[PDB]
Ligand binder design. Structure first.
Ligand SMILES: [Mg+2]
Lengths: 303, 249, 195, 76, 78, 227
C-alpha cells in the first residue's frame, strides 16, 4: 500500500486514426491525475510534422490564381496543414509533388523519399482541371512543437529568402481530440484500483505507443527541476590611441603593427628612436595611462 | 458552411450579385480558379450566341472596408447547374448559402473570469486551423506630386536607410509581386527633391568631418504602417501623358 | 549610443528593447481612460504589465466603475511624463487608492456580474450536500476537500473558523468556535483578512 | 509602497502635500544626485520616494531642512 | 532630440581640444555664436592668414575623423 | 527536441512551513498542467500518518456532550484530527491521552512511543474546567493516503463497535491547503510562457519544499516505466 506503478498493458487500434490506449493499474487519486496530466501535455507540446514553407511555380504570392487548378492556392495551404506526413529520420525535408491530367490532386502521387511516409494518401489537396497546365510545388516540412503562426517565424528569422516562399501556419500538434475515462480496474487483490483508458483521436503521423512515451518524457524533464533543484584593448592597432605624430610616425620604422607590440617596448630602444627621447616618452606613458596601460607591460600570448 | 440557417441563405447570394449567377443553365464544362465556363444546354440555347457563358470571376480586389473580395469557385467539374443557381461563391458565401463566419464549439460557462462582461475566450484551434484568419486588402497610393523644387522621382538609391530594407526592391524601388513585407519597411521608394534647408552648425560640422553629404534627395517614401504584416498582390502604376516609364511600370 | 541608433533598434525589434521596456514599464503608472467617461471613475491610473496581443487587459473589478462592458470600447491610454505626474498617478488616482465611489458610499468597484456569480455559487448551500457529516478544521480543510473532489461546494457542516475583531484601538483578538455554515464560505474566509 | 499608500497618507495626513513632497524628493533623487534611503530592488525613483515617504524619513519640514543643509554646504 | 544632443556632444568633445582650434572652429560654422564667419573674419581676431586657420582645421579633422574617440560623433550620421 | 527547463525558483517562506515556491519559466500552457498535476497528488495520493479512530470510552456520538471538558466532543475531535504526527516503524500506532487536575490539555500530555515524534506540541486539544477533572482517550494513528472522510467509512463499517469508538476525520496526507495561481512571466522574446506560483501552507512533520520533491519523485515513479 506504499506505492504502485502503472504500465501500458494494451494498445487498441480501431483504425489508423483512432487509438484507444489504456493505463493500468492506478490508485484512487492516480486515476484522475495521470489522465489529466497526460492529456494536456500530449495535446499541445507533442513533436509533430507540419507544413511551413511552400513555393509553387508560376505564382508569386499566396493570394494568386493559376491555370486549370479549380481553386485558389490559399485553399491548398489550408489542406496541406491538414495533411499528415510521418518524417521519421530527418528533422526537415523538401517534399515535392507533381501532378498532370484532369483529376483531383491527392497525396498518393507525392514524389517522396524513403524516410517520410504519407499516412493519408486520399486527402484532398487540389483539383487539376487542365492536362496542359500541370501543378508542381515544394513542401518544407519542419519538426516542431506546439503551434507557431506565420508572423512569429518571420520575427525570429531575418535572413534573405527569395519571393514565392509562402509561409504556412505550422500546426505542429498532430492530435485533434483526446479523451480519458476513469473506471474500475480488474485486480483480484485490490478491487479499489482504477483503470484509465485514453481515447486518442489523431492522425496517422504519430505512433500512439510513442505518443505516451514522448508525453511522459517531457513531464519527467519538468519534474527534473522539481526534485533535484530546490582582451579587446590589447587587440588594437597603433593609431587608435590618438597619439601625436611626433613620436607615432617614428615608431613605425622598426616594428609597429598592433598595440601589443608597443607595451612590450623598452625605454632604451625608444631613447635610440628619434623624437622619442625624454619628453614624448612621458606623453606615451600618459596616453597609455589614459587607457589603463603603462610602459613595459608584458603581454601573455597576444597574437 | 453555415450550420444554423434561416432559409433566406439560399437566395441572398443569388440576389446579391457578387456571386457567379446562372443567367443560362447547363452542364459544367471547365472550371478554373479565376473563371468558370458552363456549357449551356439545348433548351436555353440561342441561335445568335455560341452556347457558352464564361463567367470572368473577380479576383482579390479591394472593397470599401479594407477587406478581400474573392469569387472562389465552389462547383465541381462535370455536373449540371440549372438556371438561377450558383457557380462560384463570393467573399462571404458557400455554395450559394451565406457564409458570414465560421461554426465551432461554444460553451456558455465561466472560465477563470475571462468571459467577464460578455467577452470572448478562444482556443488555439481558431488560428491553429486558420479558421478565423482573414485576408485584408488595403490601398497605399504613393503619389509623386510636382512641387516647385523639382518633381518627385521614383528611384531606389535612398539615403539614411540600410541595404536590407532595400533588399526587396528593384532599381525602381517598388517591391516585387509576392514580397512578404513587414511593418516598418519601405514598399515603394518615392523620394522627393527637397529645398536647401538651412542646417544647424552642428550638422554642418558633421558634414565637414565625415562623408555624410545629404543632398536634395529626401527620405519621404511612404513606408508600411507598423503592425501591418502581409504580402503584396498587385502593384497598379499610373502615369501622366508626356512622362517616360521606368522598367517596373 | 545615440537617439537614432536606439530608434533603429526599436524599428527592427531587438531582443534587448523588450527587456528595457519591461524595466521602464515597472514602477511607472499609466492612465487608462474610457471615451466618453461617465463619472470620475471612468478614468484612473494603472500600473501596466507587458503581455502579447495588441489590446489592453483591463482588471475586471473596475469595469463597473468604468461602466464599460467589453463591447470593443476604444479606450485611450495616457502616459504621465514627469515624476510629479507619475507620483500623482501612483499615489492619488491609482485604483488601489479608491475602493468607494464619489457618488455614494457604496463601492462601484464591487465584484461585478461574473465574479459575483462565482461567489454566489461558492456561498450556496444544499440539502442533499454529499459532503455531509465531515467537520472541517477551517478554511484550509475546506479548500482541501473541495479541490480533492471528495466533497462538493455545498455542505451544511460545522467549521472551526478563526475570526478577529478590533474591539480595542486597533487591537485584534483571537477566537475560534463552531458556526453553522458551508464549505465555500470558509474557502472565501481563506481569502477574507483578519479584521 | 507599490500597492498601498494608506500608511503614508495616515502618517502624513493628506494626499496633496504628501505627493508634492514626494515629487520634490524624487526630483532631488533623479537629477539632484541624492542617495536613496530605501533599497531599490529593481524599482524606479517614484516608488522609492513613496517608500521613503511611508517610512517616516521624508516630510515637508524634513525636506526643507534637508535642502537647507545642502544650500548652506554649497554657499559656504 | 539630435539638434540638442549633437550640440552637447560637440560641447563635450571640443572642450577636450585644449587650444585655440576649438575657439576658431566654433565660429567657423556657428556653434555657440550668432554670426557665421569665414576664414577671413576669424583670421582678423586671431590669425589673419587664412591658410593657418585652414591647416588647424585640417589638423582637427585628422584628429576627429579617426574612429577611436569620436565614435559617439560617428554614430550621429543617421 | 529542446524541452526548455526553468532556471529560477526563489522559494519564499513566510512562516516555518509556508514555503511559497515559484517556478520561472515554463512552456506555453505547462503552468496550469504542473500546478494541477502536483496539487491533486498532494490532496489524494500523498502518504502520511494521522488519527483515524478514537476510544474516548464514554462518548458514543459526535453531538452528545460529556463532563470535565470545555468545548463539545466535535471540537476536541477536530483538534485531534489536526495533529502533526509521523511514525516510522509501524503503521497503526495507538497512543493514550492522560490529563488530570485543572489546565489546558495541549499536545504534550499524551503517551508517545519510540517511533512517535511530535513536531508541534503547542496544539491545544481540551481545557480542564473543574478541579481534578480527569479525562482519557486512546489516539489511534493509522497511515493513510491523501484524504478519506468519515462518510465513506461510516457506511462500510456495519459491525458492532463498543461504546466510545468514533470515527475521526482522518487527514491522511501530511500537507495542508495547497493552491496555485498561474502568472504570465516573460522571457526576452516570448510572453506566452508562464510562471507557476505554488502557494503552499503546510502542517508539521514535513517541509513544504521537501514535499514538492516528494510529490515530484512520486509522480516520476508514476511515469518511470514509460521511457
Ligand atoms: Mg460601450
Amino acid at each position: 500500500t506504499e506505492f504502485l506503478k502503472p504500465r501500458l498493458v494494451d494498445i487498441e487500434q480501431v483504425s489508423s486514426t483512432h487509438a484507444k490506449v489504456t493505463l493500468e493499474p492506478l490508485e484512487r487519486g492516480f486515476g484522475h491525475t495521470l489522465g489529466n496530466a497526460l492529456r494536456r501535455i500530449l495535446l499541445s507540446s507533442m513533436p509533430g510534422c507540419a507544413v511551413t514553407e511552400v513555393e509553387i511555380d508560376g505564382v508569386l504570392h499566396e493570394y494568386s490564381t493559376k491555370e486549370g487548378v479549380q481553386e485558389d492556392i490559399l485553399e491548398i495551404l489550408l489542406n496541406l496543414k491538414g495533411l499528415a506526413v510521418r518524417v521519421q529520420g530527418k528533422d526537415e525535408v523538401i517534399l515535392t509533388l507533381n501532378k498532370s491530367g484532369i483529376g483531383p490532386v491527392t497525396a498518393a502521387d507525392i514524389t517522396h523519399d524513403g524516410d517520410v511516409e504519407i499516412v493519408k494518401p486520399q486527402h484532398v489537396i487540389c483539383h487539376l482541371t487542365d492536362e496542359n497546365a500541370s501543378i508542381s510545388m515544394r513542401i518544407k516540412v519542419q519538426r516542431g512543437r506546439g503551434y507557431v503562426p506565420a508572423s512569429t517565424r518571420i520575427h525570429s528569422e531575418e535572413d534573405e529568402r527569395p519571393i514565392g516562399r509562402l509561409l504556412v501556419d505550422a500546426c505542429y500538434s498532430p492530435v485533434e481530440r483526446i479523451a480519458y475515462n476513469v473506471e474500475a480496474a480488474r485486480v483480484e487483490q485490490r478491487t479499489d484500483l482504477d483503470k484509465l483508458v485514453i481515447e486518442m483521436e489523431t492522425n496517422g503521423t504519430i505512433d500512439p505507443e510513442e505518443a505516451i512515451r514522448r508525453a511522459a518524457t517531457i513531464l519527467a524533464e519538468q519534474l527534473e527541476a522539481f526534485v533535484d533543484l530546490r582582451d579587446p584593448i590589447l587587440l588594437r592597432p597603433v593609431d587608435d590611441l590618438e597619439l601625436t605624430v611626433r613620436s607615432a610616425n617614428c615608431l613605425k620604422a622598426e616594428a609597429i603593427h598592433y598595440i601589443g607590440d608597443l607595451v612590450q617596448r623598452t625605454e632604451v630602444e625608444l631613447l635610440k628612436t628619434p623624437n622619442l627621447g625624454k619628453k614624448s616618452l612621458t606623453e606615451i606613458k600618459d596616453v597609455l595611462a589614459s587607457r589603463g596601460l603603462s610602459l613595459g607591460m608584458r603581454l601573455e600570448n597576444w597574437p | 458552411k453555415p450550420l444554423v440557417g434561416t432559409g433566406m441563405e439560399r437566395a441572398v447570394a443569388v440576389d446579391s450579385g457578387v456571386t457567379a449567377v446562372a443567367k443560362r443553365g447547363g452542364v459544367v464544362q471547365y472550371v478554373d480558379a479565376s473563371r468558370i465556363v458552363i456549357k449551356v444546354n439545348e433548351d436555353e440555347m440561342y441561335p445568335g450566341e455560341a452556347g457558352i457563358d464564361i463567367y470572368n470571376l473577380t479576383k482579390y480586389t479591394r472593397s470599401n472596408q479594407n477587406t478581400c473580395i474573392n469569387q472562389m469557385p465552389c462547383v465541381s467539374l462535370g455536373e449540371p447547374v440549372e438556371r438561377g443557381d450558383v457557380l462560384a461563391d463570393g467573399p462571404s458565401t458557400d455554395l450559394g448559402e451565406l457564409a458570414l463566419g465560421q461554426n465551432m464549439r461554444v460553451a456558455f460557462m465561466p472560465w477563470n473570469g475571462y468571459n467577464f462582461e460578455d467577452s470572448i475566450l478562444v482556443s488555439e484551434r481558431v488560428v491553429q486551423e486558420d479558421r478565423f484568419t482573414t485576408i485584408h486588402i488595403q490601398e497605399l497610393a504613393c503619389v509623386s506630386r510636382d512641387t516647385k523644387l523639382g518633381p518627385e522621382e521614383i528611384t531606389a538609391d535612398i539615403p539614411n536607410v540600410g541595404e536590407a530594407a532595400l533588399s526587396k526592391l528593384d532599381e525602381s524601388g517598388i517591391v516585387y509581386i509576392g514580397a512578404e513585407v513587414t511593418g516598418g519597411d519601405i514598399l515603394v521608394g518615392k523620394v522627393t527633391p527637397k529645398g536647401e534647408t538651412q542646417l544647424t552648425p552642428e550638422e554642418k560640422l558633421l558634414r565637414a568631418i565625415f562623408g555624410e553629404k545629404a543632398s536634395d534627395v529626401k527620405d519621404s517614401s511612404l513606408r508600411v504602417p507598423n503592425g501591418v504584416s502581409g504580402t503584396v498582390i498587385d502593384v497598379q502604376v499610373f502615369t501622366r501623358d508626356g512622362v517616360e516609364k521606368d522598367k517596373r511600370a | 549610443t545615440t537617439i537614432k541608433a536606439a530608434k533603429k533598434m526599436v524599428e527592427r525589434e531587438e531582443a534587448v528593447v523588450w527587456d528595457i521596456l519591461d524595466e521602464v514599464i515597472r514602477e511607472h503608472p499609466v492612465l487608462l481612460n474610457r471615451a466618453p467617461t461617465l463619472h470620475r471613475l471612468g478614468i484612473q491610473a494603472f500600473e501596466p504589465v507587458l503581455i502579447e496581443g495588441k489590446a489592453i487587459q483591463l482588471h475586471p473589478l473596475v469595469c463597473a466603475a468604468y461602466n464599460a462592458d467589453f463591447d470593443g470600447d476604444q479606450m485611450a491610454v495616457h502616459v504621465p511624463l514627469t515624476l510629479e505626474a507619475q507620483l500623482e498617478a501612483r499615489a492619488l488616482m491609482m485604483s488601489t487608492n479608491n475602493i468607494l465611489s464619489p457618488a455614494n458610499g457604496e463601492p462601484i468597484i464591487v465584484p461585478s456580474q461574473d465574479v459575483v456569480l462565482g461567489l454566489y455559487y461558492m456561498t450556496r448551500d444544499c440539502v442533499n450536500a454529499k459532503g455531509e457529516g465531515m467537520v472541517l478544521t477551517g478554511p484550509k480543510e475546506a479548500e482541501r476537500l473541495y479541490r480533492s473532489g471528495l466533497a462538493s461546494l455545498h455542505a451544511r457542516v460545522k467549521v472551526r473558523i478563526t475570526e478577529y475583531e478590533k474591539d480595542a484601538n486597533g487591537e485584534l483578538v483571537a477566537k475560534t468556535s463552531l458556526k453553522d455554515t458551508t464549505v465555500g464560505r470558509a474557502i472565501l474566509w481563506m481569502i477574507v483578512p483578519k479584521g | 509602497a507599490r500597492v498601498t499608500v494608506q500608511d503614508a497618507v495616515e502618517k502624513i495626513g493628506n494626499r496633496f502635500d504628501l505627493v508634492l513632497v514626494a515629487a520634490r524628493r524624487a526630483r532631488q533623487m533623479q537629477v539632484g544626485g541624492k542617495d536613496p534611503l530605501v533599497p531599490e530592488e529593481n524599482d524606479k525613483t517614484t516608488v522609492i520616494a513613496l517608500r521613503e515617504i511611508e517610512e517616516g524619513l521624508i516630510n515637508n519640514q524634513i525636506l526643507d531642512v534637508r535642502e537647507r543643509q545642502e544650500q548652506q554646504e554649497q554657499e559656504a | 532630440a539630435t539638434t540638442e544632443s549633437l550640440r552637447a556632444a560637440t560641447h563635450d568633445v571640443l572642450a577636450g581640444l585644449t587650444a585655440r582650434e576649438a575657439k576658431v572652429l566654433r565660429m567657423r560654422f556657428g556653434i555657440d555664436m550668432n554670426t557665421d564667419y569665414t576664414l577671413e573674419e576669424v583670421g582678423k581676431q586671431f590669425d589673419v592668414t587664412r591658410e593657418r586657420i585652414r591647416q588647424i582645421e585640417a589638423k582637427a579633422l585628422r584628429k576627429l575623423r579617426h574612429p577611436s574617440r569620436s565614435e559617439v560623433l560617428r554614430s550621429f550620421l543617421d
